[model samples]
Target chain A: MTKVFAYAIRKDEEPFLNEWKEAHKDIDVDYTDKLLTPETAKLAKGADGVVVYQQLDYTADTLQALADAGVTKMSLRNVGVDNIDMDKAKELGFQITNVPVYSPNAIAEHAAIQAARVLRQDKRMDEKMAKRDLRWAPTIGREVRDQVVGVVGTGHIGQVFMRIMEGFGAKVIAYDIFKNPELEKKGYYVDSLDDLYKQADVISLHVPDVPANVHMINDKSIAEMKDGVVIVNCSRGRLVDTDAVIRGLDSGKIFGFVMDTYEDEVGVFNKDWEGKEFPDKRLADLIDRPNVLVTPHTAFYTTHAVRNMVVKAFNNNLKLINGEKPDSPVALNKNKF
Target chain B: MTKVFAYAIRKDEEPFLNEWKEAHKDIDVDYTDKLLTPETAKLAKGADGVVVYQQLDYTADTLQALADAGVTKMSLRNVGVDNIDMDKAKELGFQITNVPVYSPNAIAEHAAIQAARVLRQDKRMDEKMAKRDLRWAPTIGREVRDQVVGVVGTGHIGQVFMRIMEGFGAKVIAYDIFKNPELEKKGYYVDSLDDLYKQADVISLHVPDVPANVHMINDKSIAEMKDGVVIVNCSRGRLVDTDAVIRGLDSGKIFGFVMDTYEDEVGVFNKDWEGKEFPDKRLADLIDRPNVLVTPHTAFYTTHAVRNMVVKAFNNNLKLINGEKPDSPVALNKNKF
Candidate 1:
C-alpha cells in the first residue's frame, strides 16, 4: 500500500481526512497534530508524500530534512505557497501541489457578511447589547441598499462578494488590472481604483499578496477614498498596511473596518490568548474599537473549504505517488534544478 | 399650524424627526424622549394629535387621560397594537393609525443575516477570534447552501427573508396559515408545519405575536424538528418558549440559535447592565452560550426603518388633524363608542 502522512492535522480536518482515507482503503494514511518543522520532518521518513498546512515559512532546513528523509512529493492543503522556499525545493527535485480553488464562496461570503455587519454597526450593537443597552442611538444602522460598494479584485471571490452585495440592492463597482470580462461587459468595473475609492461607500479587498500588491491600501490610497468609507480585507494579510488603516480609523476618515488578515499576523493569529494580555497592542487596540472587526484570518475557515482542501490535497498526493502529474501541481522552475 | 406631539422619541429617531419637521413647515411637530403614560399624557394636552411608540401596555387610565385632554387622535410608530387596550381606546373615541409597512426588508434582512451567521457559526468564530484562537476546529462553520431553510410566516418580512436565503442558494420551505399566492404557486411551501420542521435544517420565525401563535416553537414543535437544526427568532419574542429552546440547545437537539427577541424583554431588553449583574439569569445564561447569539430586539432597527416609522407616523397624525382618514389607520370598533 502507498503510504502518506499529513502534518498539522487539526480537529476540524479530521472528519474529512478520515472520509478520504475510508474511500481509499488501499492507501495507508497517518497524520500528526504537529506542523512540519525540521525536527518533525523525521516522522515522515518512510511516507511517499506529506500533506501540510501551516502559517510558518517553509525554510531551507525544513525542506532539506524532508528531502533527506527521501520524501520528494509535497501537497499543501491551502492556497498560499509564498512561504515555501521555492529555489530550495526545486534544487531538491521536489514536486509540490496546492489546493488553490477550494470553495471561494466560503471566503467571499464571510467578507460580504462582515462588510454588511460593519455598515450596520453590528459590533457596536453587540457591545451595547452585552451591556443590556438596546436603545437605538448613536448606533443606528445604515442600509446596505443605500451604499456604493467597491470590490478591489474581480476574481472568483470578488465576483461572489459582488453578487451577494447586489442581493442587498447595493450598487457595486469593481477594480482590477485584469478585468473579468463578464463584469467589464456589464459595466461594473469603474475606470480606475481612484474612481472606485472616490464613489464607494464600502471598499472590500480580494487581491492576492503579490510583491507589487504589498501595502496596496496605504495612507496615499486611503486619502483618495470617500470620508467614512468602510473597509473589508479578507484576502491576504500583506495586501494591507495595518498602520495606515489604524490612522485612517483614528482620524475618522474611515467609518468602520473589517479585518480578517493583518500584515503582521503569522505568530499572532491562530493562538489562544484568552486569559492573558494580547501580544500585539496595536491589534488589541483595533479589536477594542466598536467600528473595527478583527476576525483572526478566518475568512476561509468553513466546513466546505476545509473538506475541499483536505480531499483535494490528499488526492493530488495520491496521484503524484502513482507517478502521474498531479491535477493542481505548483509550477516550479526546472532551470533551478 | 397643525400641532403634533410625539412621545418615546429615541436618538435614532431624532434625525428623521428633524427632517420631517423641516419638510412639513405647515405642521408644528414636538417630541419628547419620555413614553406616554397617564402622568406624561398631560404634555399632549394642547396638541392636535399624539404620536407614540412603547413596549409598555397602554392602560385604561392613560387613554382616559388622553381623552380628558381632548386628544382623540393617536398614531403609533409601530405595528403591534396588542399592548393597547382596544376596548378603552374605542370607548375614548380614539382614531388610531400605525406605520405598518415601514420597510419589511429591514427586519427580514436582519433575520436572514443572523440565520446565515448561525449556520456559519459566526458567533463562535467571533468569540474564538477575540481570544486570538483562529484554529478551525470545533468552530468549523456549515455552509448555508447545503441546508434546507424553513421560514415561518409568508408575510412581507418572510417573503423578503426567503429571497435573501435564496440568494445564498439555500433550499427554502415555508409554512403559513394564510399562504402567499406567489410562494404557494411556486411550490415553495410545505403542506404542514410538522413536515417543514422535520425537513428543514434551519428554521427562521417571521410570524407575529397573536393568541394563536404564542409559543409556537415549544418543546412539542421542537421535537418535530431535525436533530441539530438551527433556529432564528427575529419576530415576536412570544413565538418561542425560551426554556424549551434552551433545553434543545443543551441536548444538542438544536445546533445553534439566533435570538433577537425575548418573551420577558420589556424592561430587561434595553437597559444597561455592563458592570452590574444581569437582572435575568436565564437570559444571561443564554447570552453566555457559544452556540447562541442574543441581540436586543433590533431586527427592525435600521436607518431606513427608523426614518420611515418617524415620517409615516407624523404624516398620519398630520392627516388626522386635517380631519381626513390616515393612510394606514388601525380599524377600531365603533360599536363600543
Candidate 2:
C-alpha cells in the first residue's frame, strides 16, 4: 500500500480526510495537527508523498529535510504556492501539486453575498439591531437590481460572481487583461479599468496578488471611480490600498466596502481576541464603521471547498506516489536546479 | 391646492416625501414625525387629506377628530389596516387608501438574503469574526445550491423569494392555498405542506397573518420538517409560533433561524436597547444563539419600498381629494355604519 502523510490537519479538515481515506482504502493515510517544518519532516520518513496546507513559508531546510526523508512528492490543499521556496524544492527534485480550482463558487458566492449585504446595509442593520435600535433611517438599503456592478477580473471566480450579480438583475460590466471569450461574446467587458470605475455603482475584485496587481486600487484608481461607489474585495488583499480606501470612505466618495481579506491580516486573522483589545486599530476602526464590512479571509471557507481541497490534495499525492503526474502540478524553476 | 398632512414621518421617509412634493408641486404636503392620535389629529386641521403609518391603533376618537377637522380623506403608507377603526372611518364618511403593492421584492429579497446567510452560517461567522476567532471549524457553511428550499406562500413576495433561491441553484418546493399560476406551470408546488417540510432543507415563510394561518409552524408542523432544517420568517410574526420555534431550536430539530419579525414585537422591535437590559429574555436568548439571525421588522425597509410607500399613498390620497376613486381603497363596513 502507498503511504501518505498530511501536515496541519485542522478540525474542519478531519471528516473530509476520513472520507478520502475510506474511499481509498488501499492507501495508508495519516495526518498531524502540526504543520510541516524541518523537525516535523521526519514524520513522513517512510511515506511516499505528503500533503500540506500552511501560511508559513516552506523554507529550504524543510524542503531538504523532506527530500532527505525520501518524500519528494508533495501536495498542497490551497491555491497559493508563492510561500513555497520554489528554487529549494526544484534543487531537491520535489514535485508539488495544489488544488487550484477546488470551488470557485465558494469565493465568488461569498463576494456576491457580501456585496449584496453592503448594498443592503446589512452590517449597519445588524449593528443597529444588536443595540436594539431598529429605526429604519439613514441606513435604508439599496436594491441590488439598481446597481451597475463592475468585476475587476474575468477569471473563474469573477465569472461566477458576474452570473450571481446578473441573477439579482444588476447590470454587470467587467475589465480584464485577458478577457474571457464568453464574456467578450456577451459584450460584458468595459473598454478599460477607468471606464469600469466610472460606470460601476459597485466594484468587485477577483485578481491574484502579482506584483503588477499590487495596490491596483490605490488613491489614483479610487479617484477615477464614481462617487459613493460600493467596493468588494474577496480576492487578494494587496490589490487594495487600505489607507486609500479609508480615505475614500472618510471623504464619502465610497458608500460602503466589503473586505474579506486585508493586506496585513496574516498575524491578525484566525486568532481569538475575545474580551481583549484588537491588535490592529485600523482594522478595528473599519469593523466599527457601519458602512464597512470586514470578514477575516473566509471567502473560500465552505464545506464544499474544504472537502475538495482535502480530497483532491490527497488524491494528487496518491497519483504522484503511483509515478503519475498529479493534477494541478506547480511549475518549478527546473533550469536553475 | 390640496393640502396633505402626513404623520409618523421618519427620517427614512423624508427623501421620498421630498421627491413626491417636488413632483406634485400643485399639492401642499407637510409632515410630522409624530403618529396620529386624537391630540395629534388637530395638526391635520383644514387639510384635504392625511397620510399616516403607525403600528398603533387608529382609534374611534382619532378618526372622529380627523373628521371633525374636515380631513376625511385618509391614506395609509403601509399595507396593514387591521389597526384602523373601520366602523368609525365609515361613520365619519372617510375615504381611505393604502399602498398595497409597495415593492414585494424588497421583503422577498431580504428573506432570500437572510436565508442564504443562515445556510452559509453568516451570523455565526460574523460572531466568530467579531471575537477575532476566525477558525473555520464547526462553522463550515453549507452551499445554498445543495439545499431544497420550501417556500410557504406562492404570492408576490414568495414567488420573488423562489426566483432568488432558483438563482442560487436551490431546489425550491412551494406550498400555498392559492397556488400561483406561473409556479404551478413550473411544477414548483408540493402536494402538501408536510411533503414540502419533509423534502426541504430550508423553509421560508411568506404567508400573510390570518386566522387560518396563525401559528402555522407549530410543534406538529415542525415535526414534519427534515432534521437540521433552516427556517426564515420575513412575513407576519403571527405566522410562526415563537415558543414552538424556540423549542425546535433547543431540540436541534431546527438548525438555524432567520427572523425579521416577532409575534410580540410591537413596542419591542424598533426601540434602541443598547447598554440597557433587554426587555424580553426569550428574544435575548434567541439573539445570543449562534445559529439564529434576528432583524427588526426591516425586510420591507428598503429605499425603493419606502419611496413606493410614500409616493403611492400620497398619490392615492391626492386622487381621493380630487373626487376620484383611489388606486388601492380598503373596503370599509359602510353598511354597518
Candidate 3:
C-alpha cells in the first residue's frame, strides 16, 4: 500500500485530513504540525505522494529531498503556487494538483460584504457601539449600487464575485489574462487593469500571486486607481503591498481595505491566540485602522469549501496513483513549470 | 420673511446644514445644538416653524410650548413620527411634515450590507486582524445567497431593501401591516411575523415605532426567532428592546446587530463627546460588543439624504406657511387620540 505524507497540519484542518485518511483506509497517512521543509522532506521515506499546505518556501532543496525519497506526486490543500520551486518540480518529474475551485462564493461574498462595510464606515461604528454610543451620526454608509466595482481576474471566483456585485446594482468591470468569452460578450470585461483602476470605486482582487502579480496594488497601481477607492483582497496578500495600502489609507488615496490573506501569514493563521499576544505589528496596525478590515484568510473555510478541498485533492491524488488523469490536473499549467 | 428654527444640530450636520442655509438665502434659518426638549422648545419662540430632529419623546408639552409661542407648523429633519405627540399637535392645529423619502438607497442599502457583514463575520475578523493573529482558523463566513432574509414593512425603503437583497440572491420574505399588493402577489410576503421569526437567518426592521409595534423584537419575539438570527434595526430603536437584545446576544440567539437608532438616543446621538465619557451604560455595553454595531442616528445624514431632508422640509414648510396643503399632511389617529 502507498503511504501519504502530509505536512503543516493545523487543528482546524484535522477534520478534513482525518476524513481523507478514513476514506483511503488502505493508504497509510502520516502528518506533523510542522510544515514542509528541506530537513523534514526526508520524513516521507515510504510515501508515494506528498500532501502539503503551508506558507513556507518550497525551495529546490526541499523538492530534491522529496524526489530523492522517491516521491513524484504532490497535492496542495490550498491555492497559490508561487512558493513552489517550479524549475525543480519539473526537473524531478513531479505531478502537482491543487483544489482551485474550492469555494469561490465564500471568498467572493466576503469581498463584496467587506467592500460595503468599508464604504459604510462599519469599523468606526463598531468601535462606537462597543463604547455604548448608540448614536448614528458621522458613521454614515454609502450605497453599493451608487459605486463602480472593478474585479481583477475573471476566473471562477471572480465571475461569482461579479454576479454578486451585479446583484447590488453596481456597475462591474473585470480584467483577466484569459477572459471568459461569455463575460466579454456581456461587456463586463474591461480593456485592462488600468481601465479597471480608473473606473472602479471598489476594486476586488481574485487572482493568484504569481511573480508578475506580486505587489500588483502598490503605489503605481494605487496611483492609477480612483482616489478614495475601496479595495478587497481575498485572493492573495502579496498582490497589495501592506506599506502601500497603509500609505493609501493615510493619504486618502484608498478609502478602505478588506484583506482576508496576508503576505506574511504562515505562522500567524490557524492558531487560537484569543487571550495570547499577537505576532505581526503591521497586521495589528491594519486591524486597529477603522478603514482597514483584516480577516484570518478564512474566505475558503466554509463547510462546502473545506469538503471540496479535501475530497477533490484526495480524489485527484487517487486518480494519479491509479494511473488515470484527474478531472482537474495541474498539468494545465505545464508551460509555467 | 419666514424664520426657520433648526434644532438638534451636530458638528457633522454642519456641512450639509451650511449648504442648505446657503441655498435658501432668503430664509432666516436659526439653529441650536440643544436637542428639542420641553425646556428648549422656547428657543424657537419667534420662528415661523420649528425644524427638529431627535430620538427622544416630542411630548405634548413641548409641541404645545412651540404652538403657544406662535409656531403652528413643525418640520422634521428626519422621518418616524412616533415620538411626536400627535394628539397634542393636532389639538394645537399644528401642520407637521417629515422628510419622508430622503434617499431610500442609503438606509436600505445599509441594512442589506450589514446583513451581509453578519453572514461573513467581518467584524470578528477585523478584531482578530487587530491582534496580529493572521491564522485562518475558526473564521468561517456564510454566503449571502445562502441566507433567508425577513424584511418587516414593505414600504418604500423596505421595498428598495428587498431589491438589493434579491440582487444578492437571498430568499426574501417581507411582512407589512399595509402590504404592497404587487409584492404580495409576487409571493414575497410570508404568513406572518411568526413565519419570519422561524424561517429567516436575517431580520431587518423598516417599520414605524407605533404603540402596537413597540418592543416587537423583545425577549418573547426573539424566542420565536431562529437561533443565531442576525438583526438589523435602521427604522426605529423602540422596535427592539435593548435588554432583550443583549440577552439574545448572550444566549447566542442573536448572532449580530446593526443598529442605527437606539431608544435612549436623544441628547446622546448627535453630541460630540469625543474625549468625554458616554453616559448610557447599556448603550456603551452594546457598542463594546464585537457582534453588535451601533451608529449615531446618522442613516439620514448622507449628502443625498441631507439635501432631500432640507429641501423637502423647507418646501413643505413653504407650502404650509403660504396657506397651501402640504404634499404629505399628517392626519390625527382618532382611535389613538
The lDDT values for all models are 0.84, 0.84, 0.78
| Candidate 3 - chain A - TM | 0.74
User: On residues B98-134, what C-alpha lDDT tens digit does candidate 2 reach at each position?
Assistant: 7887778888888888877888888777777766675
- As for DockQ, the candidate ahead, 1 or 2, is 2
- How big is the positional error of residue B105 in model 1, measured in Å on the Cα after superposition? 1.5
Query: Which candidate, 1 or 3, has the higher DockQ?
Result: 1
| TM-score, one value per model | 0.90, 0.92, 0.77
Query: Model 1 compared with the native: what TM-score?
Result: 0.90
lDDT of 1 by residue, A1-337 (tens): 9899899988889989989999999999999998998899889888998999997878888997887777989999998788788878878778999898878888888887887788888778877766667565567778787799999888778888888778777899999998878789999998878898899999999887989988888999899989989989998888888889889999999999898888778877777777777788888888778788888777777888899899999998989888887778887743432
Q: What are the chain A TM-scores of the candidates, in order? A: 0.86, 0.90, 0.74
lDDT tens digits, residue span A138-248, model 2: 678899867899998888778888788787777999988887787799899888888998989999998778789899888999999998899999987999999999999
Which candidate would rank higher by lDDT, 1 or 3?
Answer: 1
lDDT of 1: 0.84
Backbone N/Cα/C clashes per model: 0, 0, 21
- Of the candidates shown, which would achieve the greatest lDDT relative to the real structure? 2
TM-score of 3: 0.77
Judge the docking of candidate 1 as incorrect, acceptable, medium or high: medium
